[PDB]
A = this chain, B = another copy of it.
Amino acid sequence: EVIGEIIDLELDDQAISILEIKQEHVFSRNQIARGHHLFAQANSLAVAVILALTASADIRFTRQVKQGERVVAKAKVTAVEKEKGRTVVEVNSYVGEEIVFSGRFDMYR
């Protein structure tokens, strides 16, 4: 029920997942991973750090990811509104030391 493998999970705090880009994730022409796989990893990691739903998100794809790469996604909760049951999660995803994806997710109870 999460895309890629959960490596680390501190509920209501932070989480880390790893997605190895295989044949199922790429355009045949260029062996480049489709951006919705990156999103899916990050969005499901954002849900994992919290039974919760995404309300919006602002996301940014930085490098093209190639097949054979391990994408490490790192979720951190950056604000909570106890009141309205609203949590914001920022997720940055890396291949080695380089960001390939960055997103802020607005979640709800």
Contact = CB atoms under 8 A, between A and B. Distances in A.
Interface stretch (A33-41, A67-75, A83-91): A33-41
Interface of A: 1, 3, 27-30, 32, 34-36, 39-40, 43-44, 51, 53-61, 64
Contacts of A32: 53
A57 B54 CA distance: 15
A11 B29 CA distance: 19
A40 B59 CA distance: 13
16 contacts: A27-B51, A30-B51, A32-B53, A34-B43, A35-B43, A35-B53, A36-B43, A39-B40, A39-B43, A53-B64, A56-B59, A56-B60, A56-B61, A57-B57, A57-B58, A58-B59
- Determine how many copies of this chain the complex contains: 2
Contacts of A40: 36, 39-40
